[PDB]
Amino acid sequence: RVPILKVDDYWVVAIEETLHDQSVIQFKEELLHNITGVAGKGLVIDISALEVVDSFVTRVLIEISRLAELLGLPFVLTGIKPAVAITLTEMGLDLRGMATALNLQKGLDKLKNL
Amino acid sequence: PILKVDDYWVVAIEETLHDQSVIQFKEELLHNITGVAGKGLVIDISALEVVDSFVTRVLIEISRLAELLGLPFVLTGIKPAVAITLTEMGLDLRGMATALNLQKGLDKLKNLAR
Structure with a gap:
């Protein structure tokens, strides 16, 4: 449904x-x-297609950020905005200590300086 | 908050x-976790460099809550240093299962069901 791809041992997802x-x-x-089996x-997730964010989306995104941190999995969130970045930091996403990129490419490249 | 992967509850501490x-x-x-x-239940204490009397108490309590619920159980992320302490303070670690991180623990909890 939501396609989970894997490009060169990296997990790639666009929501x-x-x-x-x-x-x-x-x-x-x-x-x-x-990401456990x-x-x-690493894991790059893009949310550019989202003009707003539920708490439901926001809290699932937090759940994956916290679990990858527990699995030692590099994680980049991409495609972030005005009306997304604000509600994300609101509902509790440490965006400043989180790896973020502008698009799916900048994220892939960012999961590669490590 | 609480995390959950694969039917397995995860309390990161x-x-x-x-x-x-x-x-x-x-x-x-x-x-x-009773909803x-x-x-099973994985408790991660990898973020703990220092354990005190309060922590050992919780860990002792949660480990018992688990079995009371008939819940398989891994204590993961123990610094070898913060583990003698835990046992000195009453956490009978020899009785309970331990793993290096969230991943190995998840693998132990399920690669025990095949």
């Missing part, structure tokens, strides 16, 4: 605009199942 | 723990 809460969860459960070098 | 009561903590943890039961 589009959603309606069913229950596909984000299908995505999160699926992603967290993937077999080895990886 | 930080030095900000000393700011509620053990009892408030147990009531908080039971709110989260829908899990196949």
Whole structure:
């Protein structure tokens, strides 16, 4: 549903605009199942297609940031905005101590200086 | 907050723990993991360089809460230093399962179900 790709041992995900809460969860459960079952070098998630953010999206994004930090998985969030960065820092995302990039490419490159 | 991967509950623990009561903590943890039961519970104390009497108390309590719920259980992220202390203060570690990090613990909790 939400496609999880893997490009050169890196996990790559782009989140589009959603309606069913229950596909984000299908995505999160699926992603967290993937990044634990077999080895990886990092995880880039792009949220450029999202013009706003639920607390639901915000808290799933926090959940994956905290679990990758626990798995020693480099994590980059990309495609961030005005009306996203603000609510993200609001609901509790340490954006300043988080690896962030402008697009899917800058993130891949950023998961590679390490 | 609380994390969950693969039907497995994960409590990551930080030095900000000393700011509620053990009892408030147990009531908080039971709110989260008894709603829908899990196949297990991983407690991560990797963020702990220093353990005191309060922490050992919680760890002792949570480990017991777990089995009371019929819940398989790994204590992960123990500095070899913060582990003698824990046992000196009453955490019978020999009885319970331990793992290096969230990953090895997750692997132990499930590669024990095959």
